[PDB]
Each structure stands twice: as C-alpha cells, then as structure tokens.
C-alpha cells in the first residue's frame, strides 16, 4: 500500500523520530524496493500525486533502481514499458516540480538512453522492430520536449547536460561498452548533417536517428543570444550549464559556424556572476580542446586576442575593495579569470600582431599580477617565468613590460606574514586553512619573485643594473636607509630591517642573474667584451655595497652570503678584499652588549660569526690555490685572532686553514696537518677522560649533574616539588654556560667531524686520497674506542636502572632531561604557535634547565654519530681493523644483563637517528675490497639487534595500547600518535636498510629485471652463502612482513622475491627454519589478516613459489601444512597448481585455500 510508504517516508524524514524508528522505516522501504513490482509502483507513485515532492522523488528512485540494477533481467517488452514510463513522466513536467525532481527525471531519461540508444546501429539495414527497440525517436522526442513549455525546456537542457557529461566527461562503464555507437550519435544530434558527412561516412540508417536536420547547436546558440539580449539570467545560466559540457568533443566546424566564442564573450560582458564563471570555463575549454582543423584554432585564438579590451573591462568590473570584506560572489571569478588568462601565453607566438594585441595582453597579465591577493597574483608568476626562460616571447616581452615587471617584482619581495594589517591577510584567511599554510605559500611566492628578478637581471643586465643602482642609492639615502646605516641592532620583525633585507635579496638575485648570463649569452666574439663590462659593473657594485659600513649583524650576515656569489663571478679580482672583509667582520667587538648571556640580540651576532666562518670555509674550498700566495699572512692573522675567538669559530677557522693547507698543493702537508689537527684531537686521548669514560658516575660529574644537585639543595628543591613551577636563577644560567663550555671542550666531536669531512672534500684523485687516508690513520684508530665509549655512555644515560646510584634529589631531573618535546601538525589540536609558547614559557623556569641538559646529551649523541659516519667515509682505515664492528655495535646496543632489552630507555626517535646517521652510511660506505672482512663480523649481530629492537618496540606499543584502551586525556592520544608515527618511520628505515643491503625484486610477480648495483650484488654473496649471517636475516625478514605496516611488508616481500632465487639453495638448516616459521607467519598473520591487503597479494605469490619448492623436495612440509590447515588436501592442491601454467588461475586456487583456512 502507498499509505505505508508515505508513513515510512514521514518517519524517516521527520527530525523528531528516533534512530531506531528511522532504521525500521528504512528497512521497510528497502524491502519494498526489492519487490518485483517496484518499477510500476514507482511510476504510479510519481504519476498519481505530484504535490508530494518527497514521495515523487522516492518513486523516481524506485524507477532508477529498476533501470540501473535489474536492467539485465528485464526482457524487451519490459524495457520498452520502462522507457515509455520514463518518457511519460518526463513529458509531464510542470512548473511546480522542484529542481531535484527535474534532475532525477533527466537521470532516468539518460540511463534509459545509455542502455537503449544505438543498439540497432550495429546491424545492417535493421528492421523497424529493432529501430523501435533502439529508441530511434530519441532526438524527435527530445525536440518535442523542447517545445512543451519552459519547464520542459529546462528539463531538456538538464537531459542534454547529463547525457553529454556521462558520455564524454565521465568514464561511465555502460557507455564505455558501447562508446563507438553512442559518441557518433551525439555528434550526429549536435551537428548538421552536411557538416557531419564531411568527417563521418555512415549510411542513412544513422540519418534515421537524427530528427532535426539543422542540428542542436543551431537551436541553443540563437536561444542563448536571445536570452542575452533579453537579460534573462536564469535562462542564460541554464543554457551555459548545458553548453559548457558540449564543446570539447563536437566538430569544430559547428563551433565556428554558430560563432560560439562571440556568444561566450557576450555572456562574459554581462554582470551575472554565474554566467561569467561558466563563460570563463567555456572559453578555457574552447582554448584547450583538440583541433583537427588548425585554421579554426587560429580563428579562436585571434578572436580571443582581439577582445583584450573586453577582458580588461571584465577584470576591472570583477575587482573590489577588500579593506572591509572580500566579495565571495566574484573573488572565485577573479581567480578563474586570472587562471584562464595565464593559459593564453602559449598562443602568443601565433597571433599576427596588427592592433597591438600582444602588448595589451601582456599589460592585462601584469595588471592581474598586481592583484592584492597572493593566490590571484601567484597564478601569473609561472607565466612570467616561462616567458622569460623562452626566447619566442623575449623580443615581444622586453618591448613593453620588462621594466614594469621588474619594478613590481622588487616591490612585491616583502615579508607578507610579518606585516601588520597587510591587505594580503584578508585573502589569506579565506584561501588558507592555517597560518603555517599561508607562511609556506608566502615563502613559495617570494621564491618565484626572486626567480623573476634573477631571470630579468640575466636577460636585461644593463637595464637591471642601472635600475638596481638607482634603487639602492635612493633607499640608502632615505630615512629608513639612514636608520639601517646608523644603528647596531634592529628589530628583526619590523620595517627598517625588513626593507634592507629585501634590498639585499634583490642584490643577490641580480648577482645570480649575472651568473646565469654567463651561460645564457651565446659564445660569440662579443662575449669577452660584454663579460668584462659585467665584471667591472659587479666589482663597482661590490665596492659600493661594502663602503656602506653596515653594522646590523643579521644583515651583515646576508651581505657575507652575497660575498660568495660576488667571488664566484669576479674570482681573484676581489678575492682578497672579500676575504679580509669577512675576517674582520667576524671579530667585531660590539661593545654595546655582552655575548655570554645568550640574549636575543646576542644570537644575531652569534649567527653572523657562524655564517662568516662557514663562508670562509666555502671560499677556501672554492679558491684554494689563490690563497696559497697569501697563506703566511692568513696564518699570522688567524693566530693573532685565535685568543679573541670562540671555540666554535676557532674550529671553523682551523678548518679553513686546513682546507688551504691540503687543497692548495702547499709544501710539507703532513707537518701543517699535524700542527692543526693534533691540538684539537688531543682531548680524546686525555688520560683522565680515557679512564673516566668507562665510569658512568664520571660521565654524570662531567655533565655536571652533581653540581645541579648542589644547586637544587642550595635552593631547597625537592622531588615532590614540580620543576615546571620553580623560577630559574641567573646562577643556573652561569652554571649551564660553564657546563656546556667544558662539555664542548671535553669531547671535540665537532672538531673531528669538521676536520675529517673537510679533509675528504680535499680529495681530487686516488693517490692523494691514499696519502690522506694514511695520514688520518694514526689519528683515528687510537681514538675510535673513545668515540664508541662516548656513544656507549650517551646510550646508558637513558637507562632508568642507572639513575638509582645518583642522589635522590636529581632522580626526576635526569628523567625530565631524557624526555623530548617533538611536535607534529595533525597529531594534536595545538598549532606551532602555542607549542613554541610552551617552550618560551619554560625558559624562565627550572624545567628548561633539564630540557637544556637533555638537549646537550642529544646534541652530543648526534655529533658522535656524525663523527662515526665521517670516519666511515675515511675508507679502508675504518673497515680493515678487526675490532671496529664489535666496538661500534656493542656501543650502540646495550643488552641489559638479565633481560633482553635493546638499550632500555632510548626512545624510538633516538633509534631512528642512530640508524639513519650511523648504520646506513657505514653499510653503504664499505669498499668493494673490504666487505669480506667487515660484513661477516657486522651483519650477523646487526640483524639480531634490528630484530630484537623492532620486536620489543612493536610489542611494547601494542601492549600499551591494549592494556590502556581509553586515554586519560587528549595528551595521551597525542603521545600515542607520535609514538606510532616514530615507530612506523623506524620500521621504514629498517626496511630501507634491508633493501640497500640486498635489493628488492619488482612489483610484478613475473618481472625481476631490476639490475642490482655492484654494492648490492656483492652483499648477496656474503649474506646468502653464510649460515651465521643468513639465519638472523630471515628473522628480520620474517618479522618485517609480520609487522603491521603496509609499506615495508609490501617492500619486504618484494625483497624476498629477489631472495627466493638464492635463499632456497637446498641448505638443510635454512630449509627447515623456513618451513615452521615463514608459512606460519605468512598464512596466519599476513594472508589471514585483512590489514595487509596489498601485502596479501604479493605475499601470496611468494607463498605459492615456496609452497611448490618445499613440497616438491620435503614431504614433511606437506604434513606440516596439513596440520596448520587442520584438513584440506595439500597433495591435491599441489597437483592442481603444477598442472596450471597461468598464474591467474593458480591465484584462484590459493584464494580458496586461504579462505578455507580462515573459516577453519
């Protein structure tokens, strides 16, 4: 009964109904839908009472379900009756029908058409019965619907829109089966017969389907023009909705004949927002659609470019004042217009400029680039980059817009996010979901602006240089320039500093443009004179910039950065001047402040000095030979400077001298190398340090924990007292400064890393590489044990069992120091701002003291890992000595005496850092002549360590999740998310290690064409042909696939495929362990688990390969497989596989076995 359906709909739609009542009503409706009379019932429901819109929509939905799901079951008569019902309902459209009712009726019509139209066209001279079955009168009926009334007009427009969208724009399955008949039928109905016959050649049976001879465009386009004159907004919008989907595919002769582009431009000149947006989309579709006829494309691009005034007027109309509030009605239209305009530059080399069309187009593009919104402005930056890079537009672009574009790009190179009340933030708060997204978009925008400046300076070096000189003179003669020049410290988030920083970035971009010009300009006879003139100009600019006597440290830092780019071009000419300027700018006293208090303005001076040192090292690397002539003066000057220089900059300067000593082919390399290196490396071999490094209490005392306990006792601090509330003291600041100075002097990790890496950078040929390796040998092999011992102590510091020997008053202090405060976007409701706020708040708190101690520990661990990695790069010296593998590995992994716990207390992030920094570079750093002595003593323990660590971490994570279901607070959720992400990244690092040690075997099961590198191939000989290394390796592989991670498990199986060729080498011990474990792991935890969807498919292929191999040569495998399956017929299953050659059919057999095991 219909009354029951009405009651069910009222229940399911009323908001007062509870969820259970709604579900009961929905169940009743579902059981109604499955009735065999559902199509007729839906038709009757839709026809009887059009007043109830919801009930009519339900009836139409019943018809849709009948025509979409049960279509194949219906016979020809039922299909014809359903088509007649749909046609009758469509013809009955009145004004009271809502929009969605019309859309549903159009959907019914389109479905029936897609499933019926064109069936008889695949047969020769079909009879009238087949034509009636194939809906020959669709075009006639659709044209009849076009004239019933205006509501039927809208219905027909929706029908056309849906039909064309499904046929062409969307990859619908039904049309894809019958594309070759449906698509030419659409081309028939939209195109005139004479136009159609030019391209297509079908007979009169096709002409029977077409009713209106003139086509459908000759109806829509005049109607659209009439609606535009009558200013009928709704009709224009509907026509553009229908017209937008029927322009990419149809024959271009129809587009040209009806002057569609003129109608689109007329729509654009209207004030209707929706009409403008659809005209924009239509114009872009016309521009980007394929053109069989090039002449029609030429006419299109000509008419588009001949209406640049109209486009400029449209853009001006779309503009608005965003000071109060942005207009959401036309701001997206502005973005669409700028996007469409940015795609027109491709056609520029084809427009025959007669009325200055190209000049007007480029002026319009530049005007759109001046838009206050960065999203709108940033759309044309790619256009400008591409135009400047190419030469087809350069003569046509330099004549009109190069100076104005350069001026804009200079003016737009500001820090938008740090300007208060900037007009761009109004658009930012709507286009961007967060401040971090806006900041990174601003960074990208400034990068592209700098690219624009660099390209302009390369193309137009003379004009750019003159303009830059004038701009710099004007700025430094301005009051802001006077403030910059007559000040020592500036607010690094205020206008006076930001403007000068922008000027210096512009200068850097100009220098980069000159560097680019060095290659861009053709190597003609005039190259040398122009290059000499450019070098003279750059030298003059550098001398002018230096004479300013800039004093701001964070800006003098940028000047020093640009010094390297100046030196790259000018070479020796200014080498000494820049070197002296950098040296003297790293020793400026700055009497106003003292640098030992770690102030906000002291950090700027520290950064300036660090940048000066790193640029000194870079300059020494670039031009070592030229520095040999002046080396004694440099040595004397630096030695004089040394007492008045910090340890960090001391190491930087010593590395600079070392670079000059090694690279510049100076005499007596060994003596100078010793005199430079030995004093810094002497701290490693200190007798007190050597004897105490094996004692943890000595390590704590050197770290200063005893002094921290004394300071806490003096302040009467207790464990029960919260450290997050205790205010800090300046005595603590002095204590931490002294402790960090003594620590960095005690363990010269930075000195060793810098010296080793920069000596490695001095290698150009193998012979001096060998002599340098011999030179570094006496300084490393007596120091490696102490570095490993330091890493040992840093690992043991995190163990809670080692803290009980400490005084009770610092038991919580070391625990607070151990924990880290890493933050991720998306892992918490907090953003970066309040997280940095929490860190800033702790500064004035005693908790920051423990945080700084932990930071010192982590920094020392990071630097000792980097030192170990650098020693690996030293070559054969680190691998030939027998003690190295055990010495490193025992240090990194601390097995607890009784329990097997890999370095207790070490976080997953720490293990990630250890693996990434030490294990990977060392594993890939083994020379091909040294694997045979280091690999077999390293991998057997390394794989055991990796397996134990991964198993312990994963088991702890799942156990903590299971025994603590509900978190106490959201902070527990954040901690769990961070732990899971870090564990996933650690597993990724481990599987990357495995891949680089063996090498995977491709995604396709039958493809193994991936050529392993020489290093990868060599390892497989060591690993697969050694039981000591092989057995732990399968344990890691067996665990890796078991672990709940899609990426590694899929990758690990791919590795296993490359291993299955050789791991089953008929070895008895390997084969047996493979049997009980891998089948148990793969079948029960990978194949039977749905969490490994993609891994299941790859593991299944691997499992099938092992199943055939093991059962063939080991009857015990069949018995073992019978037991875990608890039934089945392994012998029958094996026989069926071998008789089948296709893997696809073999996969079907395994799916049955796996599914059956799942049921059992």
């Amino acid at each position: 009964g219909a009354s029951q359906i009405v009651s069910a709909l009222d229940v399911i739609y009323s908001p007062k109904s509870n969820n259970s009542q709604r579900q009961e009503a929905q169940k009743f409706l579902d059981e109604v839908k499955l009735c065999s009379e559902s199509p007729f019932w839906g038709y009757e429901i839709a026809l009887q009472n059009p007043t109830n819109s919801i009930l009519k929509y339900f009836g139409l939905g019943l018809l849709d379900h009948a025509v979409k799901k049960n279509w194949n079951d219906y016979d020809e008569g039922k299909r014809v009756a359903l088509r007649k019902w749909v046609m009758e309902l469509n013809f009955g459209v009145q004004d009271y029908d809502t929009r969605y009712i019309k859309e549903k009726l159009a959907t019914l019509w389109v479905e029936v058409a897609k499933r019926t139209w064109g069936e008889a066209l695949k047969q020769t001279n079909p009879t009238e019965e087949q034509l009636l079955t194939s809906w020959v009168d669709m075009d006639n009926n659709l044209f009849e619907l076009w004239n019933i009334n205006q509501s039927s007009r809208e219905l027909a427009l929706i029908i056309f829109r849906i039909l064309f969208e499904d046929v062409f724009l969307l990859d619908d399955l039904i049309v894809l089966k019958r594309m070759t008949v449906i698509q030419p039928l659409c081309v028939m109905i939209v195109c005139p017969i004479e136009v159609f016959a030019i391209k297509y050649k079908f007979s009169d049976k096709w002409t029977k389907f077409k009713a209106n001879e003139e086509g459908w465009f000759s109806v829509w386009i005049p109607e659209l023009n009439n609606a535009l004159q009558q200013n009928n907004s709704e009709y224009i919008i509907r026509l553009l909705e229908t017209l937008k989907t029927c322009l990419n595919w149809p024959l271009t002769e129809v587009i040209v004949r009806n002057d569609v582009l003129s109608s689109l431009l007329t729509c654009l000149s209207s004030n209707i927002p929706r009409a403008q947006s659809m005209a924009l989309d239509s114009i872009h579709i016309l521009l980007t659609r394929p053109y069989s006829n090039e002449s029609h494309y030429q006419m299109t691009i000509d008419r588009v470019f001949d209406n640049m005034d109209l486009l400029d007027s449209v853009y001006e109309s779309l503009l608005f004042d965003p000071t109060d509030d942005i207009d959401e009605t036309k701001y997206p239209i502005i973005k669409k217009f700028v996007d469409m305009i940015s795609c027109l530059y491709v056609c520029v080399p084809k427009i025959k400029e007669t009325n200055g069309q190209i000049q007007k187009y480029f002026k319009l593009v530049l005007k759109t680039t001046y838009n206050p919104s960065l999203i709108v402005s940033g759309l044309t930056l790619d256009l400008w980059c591409t135009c400047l890079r190419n030469d087809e537009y350069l003569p046509k672009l330099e004549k009109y817009v190069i100076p104005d574009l350069l001026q804009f790009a200079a003016d737009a190179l500001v820090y938008y996010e740090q300007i208060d009340g900037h007009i761009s933030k109004k658009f930012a708060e709507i286009d961007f979901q967060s401040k971090s997204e806006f900041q990174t978009f601003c960074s990208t925008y400034r990068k592209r602006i700098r690219d624009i400046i660099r390209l302009i300076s390369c193309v137009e070096l003379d004009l750019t240089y003159d303009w830059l000189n004038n701009r710099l003179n004007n700025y430094f003669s301005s009051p802001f320039g006077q403030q910059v020049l007559s000040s020592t410290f500036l607010d690094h988030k205020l206008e006076p500093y930001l403007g000068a920083l922008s000027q210096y970035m512009i200068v850097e971009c100009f220098i980069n443009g000159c560097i680019r010009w060095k290659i861009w300009y053709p190597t003609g006879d005039d190259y040398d004179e122009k290059l000499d003139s450019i070098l003279q100009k750059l030298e003059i600019l550098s001398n002018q910039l230096i004479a300013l006597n800039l004093r701001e440290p964070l800006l003098l830092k940028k000047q020093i950065q640009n010094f390297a780019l100046f030196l790259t071009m000018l070479k020796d000419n200014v080498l000494f001047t820049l070197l002296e300027k950098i040296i003297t700018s790293a020793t400026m006293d700055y009497p106003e402040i003292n640098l030992e208090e770690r102030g906000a303005e002291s950090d700027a001076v520290r950064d300036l000095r660090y940048a000066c040192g790193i640029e000194l090292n870079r300059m020494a690397l670039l031009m070592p030979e030229s520095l040999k002539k002046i080396y004694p003066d440099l040595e004397s000057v630096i030695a004089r400077i040394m007492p008045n220089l910090s340890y960090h900059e001391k190491i930087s300067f010593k590395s600079f001298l070392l670079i000059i000593v090694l690279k510049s082919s100076l005499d007596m390399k060994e003596e100078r190398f010793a005199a430079i290196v030995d004093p810094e490396l002497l701290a490693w071999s200190d007798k007190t340090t050597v004897v105490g490094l094996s004692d943890l209490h000595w390590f704590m005392e050197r770290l200063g924990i005893v002094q921290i306990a004394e300071y806490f006792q003096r302040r009467d601090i207790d464990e029960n007292s919260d450290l997050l509330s205790i205010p800090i003291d300046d005595e603590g600041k002095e204590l931490k400064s002294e402790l960090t100075k003594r620590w960095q002097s005690l363990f010269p990790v930075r000195a060793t890393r810098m010296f080793i890496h920069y000596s490695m950078q001095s290698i150009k040929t193998d012979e001096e590489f060998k002599m340098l390796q011999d030179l570094w040998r006496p300084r490393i092999v007596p120091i490696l044990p102490y570095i490993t011992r330091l890493l040992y102590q840093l690992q043991s510091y995190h163990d809670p069992d080692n803290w009980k020997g400490l005084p009770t008053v610092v038991q919580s202090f070391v625990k607070y120091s151990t924990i880290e405060r890493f933050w991720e976007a998306g892992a918490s409701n907090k953003s970066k701002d309040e997280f940095i706020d929490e860190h800033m708040k702790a500064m004035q708190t005693l908790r920051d003291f423990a945080d700084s101690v932990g930071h010192i520990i982590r920094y020392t661990r990071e630097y000792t890992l980097l030192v170990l990695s650098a020693i690996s790069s030293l070559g054969s010296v680190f691998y030939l000595l027998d003690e190295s593998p055990d010495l490193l590995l025992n240090s990194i992994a601390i097995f607890k005496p009784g329990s097997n716990e890999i370095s207790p207390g070490v976080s997953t992030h720490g293990w990630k850092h250890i693996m990434n920094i030490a294990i990977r570079p060392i594993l890939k750093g083994c020379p091909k002549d040294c694997l045979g002595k280091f690999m077999p003593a390293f991998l057997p323990k390394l794989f055991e360590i990796l397996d134990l660590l991964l198993c312990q971490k994963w088991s702890s994570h799942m156990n903590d999740m299971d025994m603590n279901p509900v978190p106490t607070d959201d902070d527990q959720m954040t901690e769990e998310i961070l732990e899971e992400n870090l564990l996933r990244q650690l597993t990724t690092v481990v599987v990357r290690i495995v891949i680089d040690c063996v090498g995977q075997g491709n995604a396709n099961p039958n493809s193994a064409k991936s050529r392993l590198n020489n290093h990868q191939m060599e390892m497989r000989k060591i690993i697969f042909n050694d039981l000591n290394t092989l057995a732990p390796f399968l344990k890691l592989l067996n665990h890796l696939i078991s672990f709940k991670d899609t990426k590694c498990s899929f990758n690990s199986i791919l590795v296993m495929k490359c291993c299955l060729t050789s791991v089953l080498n008929q070895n008895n011990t390997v084969d047996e362990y493979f049997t009980f474990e891998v089948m148990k792991n793969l079948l029960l935890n990978v194949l039977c688990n749905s969490a490994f969807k993609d891994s299941f498919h790859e593991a299944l292929y691997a499992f099938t390969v092992i199943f055939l191999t093991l059962c063939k040569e080991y009857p015990s495998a069949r018995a073992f497989l019978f037991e875990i399956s608890n039934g089945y017929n392994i012998d029958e299953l094996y026989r069926n596989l071998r008789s089948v050659d296709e893997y696809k059919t073999q996969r079907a057999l395994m799916i049955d076995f796996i599914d059956w095991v799942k049921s059992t």
């Binding site: 890079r389 660099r454 680019r516 300009y521 190597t523 950065q561 690397l621 810098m754 920094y859 990071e862």
Partner: peptide
C-alpha cells in the same frame, strides 16, 4: 638539528637552473 657542511661539488650557492645550456 646538526650544523651544515660545504661540499666542493656544491660549494657555489647559486640556484641557476641546471637544464640551461645556451640561448
């Protein structure tokens, strides 16, 4: 977290597009 080091293969800090060969 750690400090950056200059390599002799990339010591020049210019960001010129590598694909450029000539005009």
């Amino acid at each position: 977290l750690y400090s950056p080091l200059i390599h002799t293969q990339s010591a020049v800090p210019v960001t010129i597009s590598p694909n450029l060969v000539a005009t």
